[PDB]
Amino acid sequence: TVVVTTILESPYVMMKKNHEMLEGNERYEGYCVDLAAEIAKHCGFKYKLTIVGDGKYGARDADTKIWNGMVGELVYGKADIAIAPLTITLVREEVIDFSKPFMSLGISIMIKKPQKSKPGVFSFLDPLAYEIWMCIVFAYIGVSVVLFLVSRFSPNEFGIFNSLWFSLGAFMQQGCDISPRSLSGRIVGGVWWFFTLIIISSYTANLAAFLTVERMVSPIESAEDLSKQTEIAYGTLDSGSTKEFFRRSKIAVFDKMWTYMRSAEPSVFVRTTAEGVARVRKSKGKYAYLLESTMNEYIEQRKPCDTMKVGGNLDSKGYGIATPKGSSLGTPVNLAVLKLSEQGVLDKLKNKWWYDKGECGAKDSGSKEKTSALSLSNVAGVFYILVGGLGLAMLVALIEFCYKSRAE
C-alpha cells in the first residue's frame, strides 16, 4: 500500500544484531518504528519501511535543485509517507506538506564531558588569592621593619638583615635562636605568631576542601560564551537544517557564528552524525558539534558518558511527518496525528523510549570516585622554585667572593 521513507538514527530507527538472522518487520526498532506502527494503525494502512539507499537527510541542491536524501524520495513520488526525524522549515514546507511536530526541540551544543583538568605548575597556591599572598609579603616586610625600629631605640643583635630571618621562620613554623627581650618587641613577635597560626591552618583547611570536594568546569555554555571563545571549532551537519539556518543567520551572535562557520578548517561540516559523536570524543577541547537536542540528550544517556549538553535550545523546531503536496493520506495522517497528541502517545512512548536505553546521571557522580595519591604534577612547581632557589643561591655565593676579594 504505502511506502515509508526514513533513515536509521538512534534512538529513532535502530537495527538490532540479528537483522540478517530474522527480519519479519523487526529489522529496525525504536520510538520512530513503533510511532510509525501507531500512525499506520490509526490511519489503517500497512507499511513497507524502506530506508533510503543514499542514506541522507537531504535538501535540494544549490544551483542544481535536486532533492537529495529523503526529500528525493518524498518529492519525486517513489515514497509516499515519511515517519522520519526531519526538520520542518520554510523551503521544506514550500514543496511538500508536513504534519504537527512530534516534539519541541532545537539546536543544542554537544561538548566533551571533561575529566580531571591538568593543574598548572603554580597550582599549589590555588587555595589563596593573589591579593592574600601579596598582603603576606607587605606584612612580612612591615613587621621586620617595625622590629628594626623597635630594636633601634632600646638597648643589639636585631639588625635589618637579622629581623628578616626571625620573622621568616615564624611564618615558616620554624623556631629561631634569638628571641626579643623587650616588652615592645615581644608584642610584635606575638601578634606575628598569632598571625601565621591562622594562615597555615587556613591554607591546610582550604586545600583539603579542594581535594575532598571537586567542582566540574564548563568553559563554554549558553551560546554567548561560544560567541567570545574562538578556540573551539563549531560543527554542524550539512545538507540539512543546521547548514541553512545558520546560513540564514540574522542575529548578530549568529552572524559571528556563520562568519566563523564559513571561515573554519577543516570541519566546516561533517557528513555523519555518528562521526560528529566520534569527532568530539577525539577533539578534547578544540572542537564542538551542534545538533538536535534530543539526539544530544540521548547520546548522553547512552553510556560512554563522555558527552555533555550545555546551554539550551538555540531555536524552536519540530519533527513532522513529511507528506507530498496534496497528499492522498495527509489529512488522514493529520487527524491521526491529532489522535496521538490528544492523549499523548507522542508523550507516553517518548516517556518510555527515552528512559529505556539505560541512564547516565547521578549514579556515577556519587560513589564512582576515590581520591588518589597526589601526583608529582600537583607539587611539581615547588621543586622548580626549590631548584630555582638553589640556582639563585650559588649565584649569590659567587658575588659574595667578588666583594670579599675587594678588601685589597
Ligand X SMILES: N[C@@H](CCC(=O)O)C(=O)O
Given the C-alpha cell 591562622, which residue does it identify? 198
Of 36-44, 113-121, 238-246, 325-333, the segment contacting ligand X by CB under 6 A is 238-246
243 binds ligand X (CB under 6 A): yes
Q: Is 11 in the site for ligand X (CB under 6 A)?
A: no
Range in contact with ligand X (rule: CB under 6 A) among 81-89, 151-159, 198-206, 383-391: 81-89
* Nearest-approach distance from CB 56 to ligand X, in angstroms: 8
The answer on whether 272 is annotated among ligand-binding residues is no
Among 185, 189, 240, 311, binds ligand X (CB under 6 A): 240
Q: Is 6 annotated as a binding residue?
A: no
Q: What residues from 275 to 314 belong to the interface with ligand X (CB under 6 A)?
A: 291-292
Residue 198's binding partner out of a second copy, ligand X, none, with CB under 5 to 8 Å set by partner kind: a second copy
* Footprint on residues 123-162 left by ligand X (CB under 6 A): none
Distances (CA, A) of 209 to 111, 204, 213, 374, 375: 28, 9, 6, 14, 17
Applying CB under 6 A, does 270 fall inside the site for ligand X?
Answer: no
CB of 20 to a second copy, least distance (A): 21
Instruction: Kindly compute the dihedral angle of the four CA atoms of residues 365, 366, 370, 374, in this order, to the nearest 10 degrees.
Output: 60
242: contact with ligand X by CB under 6 A: yes
Q: Which of ligand X, a second copy, none lies near 242, with the C-beta cut-off 5 to 8 A by kind? A: ligand X
Please state, in angstroms and rounded to a whole number, the distance separating the CA atoms of residues 137 and 123: 19
Please tell me the distance from the alpha carbon of residue 6 to that of residue 86, in angstroms, as a whole number.
9
Q: Flag whether 241 is marked binding.
A: yes
Residue 155 labeled ligand binder: no
Residue 157 interacts, among a second copy, ligand X, none and using kind-specific CB cut-offs from 5 to 8 Å, with none
Residue 368 DSSP one-character state: S
Using CB under 6 A as the binding rule, whether residue 108 contacts ligand X is answered as no
Cα separation, 88 vs 317, in Å, equals: 7
Judged by CB, which is closer to ligand X: 147, or 270? 270
Nearest residue relative to ligand X (C-beta): 240
**What x/- string results for residues 82 through 101 when contact with ligand X is judged by CB under 6 A?**
---xxx--------------
Buried b / exposed e across 179-194, counting CB within 10 Å, b at 16+?
ebeeeebeebbeebee
Name which of ligand X, a second copy, none residue 113 binds, using a CB cut-off of 5 to 8 Å depending on partner kind: none
The option from a second copy, ligand X, none interacting with 243 (CB < 5 to 8 A, set by class) reads: ligand X
Task: Report in angstroms how near the CB of residue 67 gets to a second copy at its nearest.
Answer: 21
Between 243 and 350, name the residue whose CB sits nearer to ligand X.
243
CB contact at 8 A, 276 and 237? yes
In whole angstroms, what is the distance from residue 337 CA to residue 346 CA? 9
- The count of residues interacting with ligand X (CB under 6 A) is 11
> Using alpha carbons only, how large is the chain's radius of gyration in Å?
34
Instruction: State the Cα–Cα distance between residues 82 and 319, nearest whole angstrom.
Output: 11
Query: Does residue 6 touch ligand X according to CB under 6 A?
Result: no
Other C-beta atoms closer than 10 Å to the C-beta of 52 total 22
Q: b or e along 283-320 (b: 16 or more beta carbons within 10 Å of the residue's beta carbon)?
A: beeebbbbbbbbbbbbbbbeeeeebbbbbeebeebebb
Closest CA to 82 of 274, 346, 295, 333: 333
Cα distances (Å, whole numbers) of residue 379 to 125, 160, 211, 330: 10, 33, 13, 68
Residue 240 interacts, among ligand X, a second copy, none and using kind-specific CB cut-offs from 5 to 8 Å, with ligand X
Closest to a second copy by CB, 23 or 157? 157
Which of 31, 45, 47, 57 binds ligand X (CB under 6 A)? It is 57
Q: Residue 73 interacts with ligand X (CB under 6 A)?
A: no
First to last CA, the chain: 114
Q: Kindly list the residues in this chain that would bind ligand X in the complex (CB under 6 A).
A: 57, 85-87, 237, 240-243, 291-292
Residues within the annotated binding site for L-glutamate?
85, 87, 92, 241-242, 292
